[PDB]
């Protein structure tokens, strides 16, 4: 859902980060919070930014003035797991008189 009244402000809400570089793609439900400088080119980065060397994360400059595709959206994903564990998450029972 749209969160253009929560996660954006005039001047830019910079409280959210995302990854622009990763050596390989994520596995399903993988999280990657490393902070090493990504080497995009051939020049050795040696831990710092420079030509073709970038910090892998970027901020989202969220503003209420952005067009809809760039307004912030809050996303919640429901992953439902069937384990050997007892079921504990079940909807309401359809009881009657």
């Amino acid at each position: 859902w749209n969160s253009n009244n929560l996660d954006s402000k005039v001047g830019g809400n910079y409280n959210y980060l995302y990854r622009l570089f990763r050596k390989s793609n994520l596995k399903p439900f993988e999280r990657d919070i490393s902070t090493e400088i990504y080497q995009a080119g051939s020049t050795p980065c040696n831990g710092v930014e420079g030509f073709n060397c970038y910090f892998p994360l970027q901020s989202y400059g969220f503003q209420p003035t952005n067009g809809v595709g760039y307004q912030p959206y809050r996303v919640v994903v429901l992953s439902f797991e069937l384990l050997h564990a007892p079921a504990t998450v079940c909807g309401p029972k359809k009881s009657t008189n």
Partner: nanobody, 122 residues
């Protein structure tokens, strides 16, 4: 249809300042996540990264050699990036160039401005 178009070079005295301007033709800096930075090539030297601005994230970055003196900014209504170089010294004489870095894995600088000469001298 894309070109980086720049101007603003010339002669500045040491201790003074000079402002460069690079227009984004054919693309939009803020809305297409196309970032603009500046590069300089001093006589006798190769290319050295000076500054980068990312208006879509609201952040600026600088090279160690210019930190504390140079400020990079942009005006998204003019689709133009600027470099404000304060407290210039003779050692800062270089041809300055603007360059595009799209959001990105691999990356690099594909589009370059034509360059302009900034001369700092007494």
């Amino acid at each position: 249809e894309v070109q980086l178009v720049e101007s603003g070079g010339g002669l500045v005295q040491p201790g003074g300042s000079l402002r460069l301007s690079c227009a984004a033709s054919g693309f939009r800096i803020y809305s297409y996540y196309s970032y603009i930075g500046w590069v300089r090539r001093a006589p006798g030297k190769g290319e050295e990264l000076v500054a980068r601005i990312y208006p879509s994230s609201g952040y600026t970055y600088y090279a160690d050699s210019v930190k504390g003196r140079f400020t990079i900014s942009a005006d998204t209504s003019k689709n133009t990036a600027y470099l404000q170089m304060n407290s210039l010294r003779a050692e800062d004489t270089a041809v300055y160039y603007c360059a595009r870095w799209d959001f990105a894995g691999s990356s690099g600088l594909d589009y370059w401005g034509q360059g302009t000469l900034v001369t700092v001298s007494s």
